[PDB]
Nucleic acid binder design. Sequence first.
RNA 1: AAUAGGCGGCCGUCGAGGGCUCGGGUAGAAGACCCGGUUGAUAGGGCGGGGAUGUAAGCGGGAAGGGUCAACCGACCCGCUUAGUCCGCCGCCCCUAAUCGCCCGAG
RNA 2: CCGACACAGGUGCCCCUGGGUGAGAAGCCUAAGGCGUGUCGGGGGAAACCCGGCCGAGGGAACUCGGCAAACUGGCCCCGUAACUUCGGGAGAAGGGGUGCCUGCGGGUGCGUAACCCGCAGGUCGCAGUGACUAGGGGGGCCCGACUGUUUAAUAAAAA
RNA 3: GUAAGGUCCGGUGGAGCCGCCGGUAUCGCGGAUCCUGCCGGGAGUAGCAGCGUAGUCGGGUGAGAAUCCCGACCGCCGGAG
RNA 4: ACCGAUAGCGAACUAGUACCGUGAGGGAAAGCUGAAAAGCACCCCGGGAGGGGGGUGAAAAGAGCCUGAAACCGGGCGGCG
Lengths: 94, 364, 49, 61, 151
Amino acid sequence: AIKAGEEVIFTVPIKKIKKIVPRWKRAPRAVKFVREFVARHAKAQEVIIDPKVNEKIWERGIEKPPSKLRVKVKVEEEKREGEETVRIAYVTLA
Amino acid sequence: GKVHRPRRGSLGFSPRKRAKSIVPRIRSWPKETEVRMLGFAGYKAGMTHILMIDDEPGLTNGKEIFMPVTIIETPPLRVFGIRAYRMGYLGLETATEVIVPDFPLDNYPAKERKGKPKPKMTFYKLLERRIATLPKNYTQEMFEQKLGQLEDMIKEGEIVDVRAIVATQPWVIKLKKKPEVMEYAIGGTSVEEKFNYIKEKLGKELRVGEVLKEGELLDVIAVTKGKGTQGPVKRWGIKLRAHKDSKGRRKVGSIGPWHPARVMWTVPMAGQMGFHHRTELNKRLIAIGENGKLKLDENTEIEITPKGGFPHYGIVRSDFMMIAGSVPGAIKRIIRVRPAIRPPKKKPPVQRPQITYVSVESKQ
Amino acid sequence: NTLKMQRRIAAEILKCGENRIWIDPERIDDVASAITREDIKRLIKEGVI
Amino acid sequence: GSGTATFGKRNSTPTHIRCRRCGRVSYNVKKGYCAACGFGRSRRLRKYRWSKKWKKKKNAH
Amino acid sequence: RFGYSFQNFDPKRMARASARDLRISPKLAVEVCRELRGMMLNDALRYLDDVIALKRPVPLKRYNDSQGHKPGKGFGPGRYPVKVAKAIKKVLLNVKNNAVQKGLDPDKLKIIHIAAHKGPVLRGWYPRAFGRATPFNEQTTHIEVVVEEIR
RNA sequence: AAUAGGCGGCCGUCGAGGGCUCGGGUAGAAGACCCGGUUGAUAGGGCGGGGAUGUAAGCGGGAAGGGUCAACCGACCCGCUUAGUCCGCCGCCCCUAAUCGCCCGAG
RNA sequence: CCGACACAGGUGCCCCUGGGUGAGAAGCCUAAGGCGUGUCGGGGGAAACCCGGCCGAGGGAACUCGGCAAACUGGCCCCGUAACUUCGGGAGAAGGGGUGCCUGCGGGUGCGUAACCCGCAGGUCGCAGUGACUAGGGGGGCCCGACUGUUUAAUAAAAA
RNA sequence: GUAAGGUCCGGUGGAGCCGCCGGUAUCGCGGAUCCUGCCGGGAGUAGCAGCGUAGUCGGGUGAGAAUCCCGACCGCCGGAG
RNA sequence: ACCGAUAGCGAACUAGUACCGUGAGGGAAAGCUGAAAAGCACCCCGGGAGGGGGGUGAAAAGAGCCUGAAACCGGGCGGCG
Ligand SMILES: [Zn+2]
């Protein structure tokens, strides 16, 4: 797994959702897929996606998101409000 | 009658419902004198084509012709049970059955993953994936005592038939771990001889080469590919409505007359298409391979697996059969074969024909 | 509050379309606090708008 | 035509406006008389026996 | 509405609460109450939390037209009435507080009676073709609950 | 199939056997069905095989000419280059996720 | 604003409109200005079927009351153009050839190597050069009414 | 009591009501595609598509945010929005 | 010896009022806490609406207020299933 503090590289395969959605929703579907993938793989209760990676996803318009996206994930523990410990992931380009 | 045409579709395959089980059943068996297991099971691998010198009767006899073939991989079956049938009031009834006790498994492809040694599988561990409730504290003494009781009933004469219960071994070809359990009838005219055959083969492995004969006809049983819900145009092949029709074109025009005041069961309708239990007759067995290789002239052997592997399927590693033509089912589907139950009067000789070319080029 | 009056007045003062007015995303509190045209001009001078 | 699209042309000068005499919005503006009390057409009020409107005013019907 | 349909309420051993004129579906309220009946208070609260989080379908036995089935045994039509679950959860918290104030152990509270009723309807209209105005109404719901400290 | 069946096994008089949840399709409108779930190659990632197009960007040279017949500009062509790009196909490697957990259940 | 409505109609499109391509206030792209309120969202190889589009081998109207729908042609330059005729026309009849980019010259008006337009030679790439957008299918008989125009607002646009 | 109907008991209600004789009447309800009011099944269903398919990521206010506000990205109209 | 709030004038009341049609003109629905507001002080919870205690009153008759039927809907109980 990933403990708080270190960073990892992931290769999100955005291509897996291109054909299950209409052509004009592919970009938001890819953003949602990236969020789900990062949360699942980092075991993070929350995910914070950088505007830079969002713009990378939206570069070629709403219809042509990149097939593969290489992202940098950094995990931290907040333990806020006393409701157990919440894991927050931060996603950045490359 | 004004204009007449044959009905759309066949009523002999109704209801067109999903198959009861994904493992095909065999309702009838061929009548034979040779004491052998009547059929075999395997997994669909793919299709290719060959060029051979035709030998069956016809104009193209002794000439080089093109023939498509379906390759199906057939890892050996494990004979692990024997079942006895008596005659009931309305039909055959199961008098009893007996299965061998647990034994170590010597063909499990275990790999030494870092940490812990090799798993050391044994039978009753792959079988519990299908049965899920197997005998506890089962020993050879009680197994032999049960076998003796079954033999004693056979001698008394209340047993009218005997069948062999076998299980597949997908783990050998690394397709899956859950096995599939079936029972096969045996040829011959003496229940005692059939029982002795099964007893000799109890707990052992059986290969296609020991049961099936190259060049003979077979019947193939499987569950066809699934297509989901389909409209009448594709399900029954009805005629499209006129292009000026403003209420659709892929639908039946009238679903019945005024009287009877009901919709008849013979009117084409939408519903499940595919994933049906079907049987195809008179499929010739071209060749039986071994270890994924085919011997052609005793000097050159070629690997049946095409370059890049079979599409949607792995690499053939065990014994396989090359059936002439097409077979129902999808890739990796379990397919059963039995000796032809209805062969023609004139049939090809029982021997491998002369093969001049085998297509092993990339199929994807 | 909804930054509508401030945006409209800033556009009027600067003589440009409202879509061409830029408000500092990290001084929303100050922009909302400004209520008069004098305050809006002061913010423009400071560079918040 | 003759239906919904026709009623969109009711943005011209209203046919009737308020009447200085009877206070009702019945003063034909283009012709110059009241369709209720006759203002601008006669000195005396427009009153008819087949009409109950002028009795409704004083609850005398 | 103020009165309850419970007969033998005992102020020494029982607590009660209600909500009136709730703007939710009375049908779904009835369906959820049918399932909540007879459960412990904590179990009912967890049930409602699962329904709100969409981790657990509510079966439909009376009002289930054109409703698809759900995975698992017993389904059969089911759905997730989030709004009804939220309102009923608030009512259950209120009754829990009433019991605690009376001095009843919250861990032994069993929902002995729970019911839903159709309250006043707020009328409205919507325009339709051919110059026709058609009813467009809201149906409000009353909820009543009384819990008992079991022993 | 109201004569609502036969057989081997497992459990009960705590408990076999399941459902939800997890990774995917030999399946699919909801349900249902099939394979996998650390007794692991189910999906992703890496590498290798096989494919579809058709030789990338960059650099070097030529080019009908023009230019002070100089510097430079120039459609296009040739070499590095079966290249570059991509893969809803296959093989090997536990590097990541198949986890934690919840509820029926005969008596 | 009127139409019962925060109505895809009508009133008011009543007056006005940067850049490229281009004959153009056409189509397409874009600056200014405006909007994300022609206001319910989420899921999915998640089907059948229905509406709106793109392509379909071989044949080419065998379909049908009837080529209904779709399809062919399509801009511009050059050559060439029938019966008939009221001599005006028919006529863009019909039919045929060309069209890109690049390197240099010649010409018209012009003070000009400003701006607009018109030809010429050579080299070169693609299946395709009005490459997208824009953008006629054609011909031959018969009946009726000379033509432009008007008509049953809400099933008849016609020979009336 | 054949009956139209009468009377009695238990409960709610809080100020009027009846037996008999003799008269009077807007004097007796199942229907009139009857009139007025209220409520049912259809149904948690259709509709919230078609003529311009537009949202996403960080931050903010707030009990509560797909729908409100600011920044970036991506889009629509651009002889009309 | 008239009716007693779907009756009686259309109007028992902010009724020839609201509202409909360009206009002539057409034209509704809607009465009642209690003897006295004594119209619920204080406490717990909820964002709030409200809920539960506790008070007032002969009686909540609690302003959504005299009595409170039928149709319809939710629950409990007895019988069938
Ligand atoms: Zn007047």
